[model samples]
Target: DSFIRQHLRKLAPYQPILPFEVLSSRLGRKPEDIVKLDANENPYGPPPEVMEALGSIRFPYVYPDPESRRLRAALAQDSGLESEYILVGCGADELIDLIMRCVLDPGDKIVDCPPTFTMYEFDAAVNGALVIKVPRRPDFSLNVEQIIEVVKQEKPKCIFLTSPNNPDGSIIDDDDLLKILELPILVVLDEAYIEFSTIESKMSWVKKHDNLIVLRTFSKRAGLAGLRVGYGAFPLSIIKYLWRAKQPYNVSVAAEISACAALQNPTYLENVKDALVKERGRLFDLLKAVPFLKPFPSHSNFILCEVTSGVDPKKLKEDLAEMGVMIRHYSNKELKGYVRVSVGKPEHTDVLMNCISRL
Candidate 1:
């Protein structure tokens, strides 16, 4: 307490997600019986090849390569970017904080748009930087005009944006992004769920736009969330400092091998993506049938619904939890009266629908 920094003295703990076993115990049900659709995790985990590869690890005792050459080489092929432009991290989360550390100085300000991924704001504050929020529209689309105004007036260092953005699944259009690029702020575009997006990854665009950084993860795409593997594309000039600052072994040998194996089986990965995309539509239709819910159109593997009737959002989530259906309800005030559900397998969808009817 005596040594605590002034900026962080009042900071709250980032709420921890309960483990699977812990949830099972709390709910009085087996883990397999719970229809878990909260975190946008792929229920169909990594390809069989990833399992084969993880078990095939031969040299784990030695430290991982600082360069993560093998995975970067694989990612280079995947994104059509040069190996030098790509850097791997424990997760896209790590890169988010890493980018802030590199770019945000103490007392400097960064631009954040919400209700979206809260990590950007959290990271900015953790870095001792001020957050200048640009509020989103009712439809959850970016207010480009507001962002432009903030840039000229506030002079924030960088902006954090997401494609098929979290909570509501809205995406930025090409013209929207092109206009933002004209401003002097560095843009960090997170494409963590781009596999489910109708749009393409902007990773290759980093080569042409020196001020832009695009981050993607093996989590949703390859179902490697637990493995903690994510990659980012940066211009050569910017990546030079990231390389100098990052810990040598942030990406473990286990994660490297798993990512490499996932990249090797695009057929399995692509097929799963196809299935989830198809199912997201099915879930949206099913959700629309509910008189009390107004589900938003989504290009990602989740749907956000506004509570429209007498039903309280918190109570709905609690009731579902008791019935062994785990979905997300926000405690944060920005998303009050709304809930988000991740797209799981078709069978998981059936169970969730059944539970909703019961409610």
Candidate 2:
């Protein structure tokens, strides 16, 4: 008999993107020359204070606070929520996996609203959970009625949700969220891009709703993706069990200080966000003018566009990459004919728009 579990043997591996340094070398372009806009990353990095804090760390050799007290306290002030409800992770990536590990039992089912963050599906698979998907509506809005129906029938353990969802950036309206919140299943709301949206995070909702969890990250807002720091807001009751399950040193010293330092300079983050939002407007206008692309209105850092006749979405992504301008194209049929571009600096936008014209 095979040593691997039956479900594990049949599970597909998750495909992750290559690092830009690798792309720069393979494409024969200097890293500086590349206009990297594929991922929903902040082109402008964290405040100067972040680097200063990282370099000045008194003990790189010492272990990070397993509880991440200082970091949690800082976020407590930043998010207007008490530190008791917060738990920090290496990345929100870790917390997502951590939640599945802590909450899901083998063969338990989790609900996914498709064309949303793909990570939910992958994490669900890794945790040996069954995924029952409820695809979003045509405009990238959740089909709330269908979700209610599924909840009544399937009685799944938990449901993953994204506000200003990935790929299209459409937010979940409070009306729909409230409707779903009344259901019996646990709700995990991913707010990784919430800062970019006009709406404030629903982290406070965790206090009122026993089943709701709101996860956010320093990756996009602080440009600390390389450092990997993220935190989530959970009901105080549920958070106790999670505290027991997570690894002691899950968040590193560098990641903790980097995030805390980035938070110290709120002005820098606000200004950077302002610039990205402004750039998104200009980028949207530019894409709207393109004859072969139909860009969707977004509440987040990236815009998803439908590829019309003549231009091949997959080919367009390849062509842009060759020119040192990276963008994303989905292989899944739900977004098969679409492409997504992140809001970068004005110069990055200029390069991308120019490359598209040439293509």
The most accurate candidate by lDDT is: 2
Q: Model 1, range 1-359, lDDT digits (tens) per residue?
A: 47988888767776897676777888887888789999999999999999998987999899999899999998888878999999999999999999999998899999989999978878887899999989889899999999999999999999999988998898989899889998998999989888897688899999889999999999986899999999999999999999999988889999999999998999999999999999999999999999999999988889999998888999999899888888999987999889999999999999999999999
1-359, model 2: which lDDT tens digit per residue? Answer: 89998888888766788777888999887887889888888878889999899888999888889999999999999889999999999999999999999989999999999898778988898899999999998899999999999999999999999988998999999999999999999999999999888898999999999999999999997799989999999998999999998899979999999998998898999999999999999999999999999999999999999999778999999988888899988877778899999999999999999999999
- List the global CA lDDT of all models: 0.91, 0.92
Over 4 Å off in model 2, which ranges? 14-16
Q: Least accurate stretch of 10 residues (summed lDDT) in model 2? A: 11-20
In model 1, which residue pairs have backbone atoms overlapping below 3 Å? none
Each candidate structure's TM-score, on Cα atoms with residue i matched to residue i, is: 0.98, 0.97
Which regions in candidate 1 have their CA more than 4 angstroms from the true location? Answer: none
How well does candidate 2 match the true structure in TM-score terms?
Answer: 0.97
Q: What C-alpha lDDT does candidate 1 achieve relative to the native structure?
A: 0.91
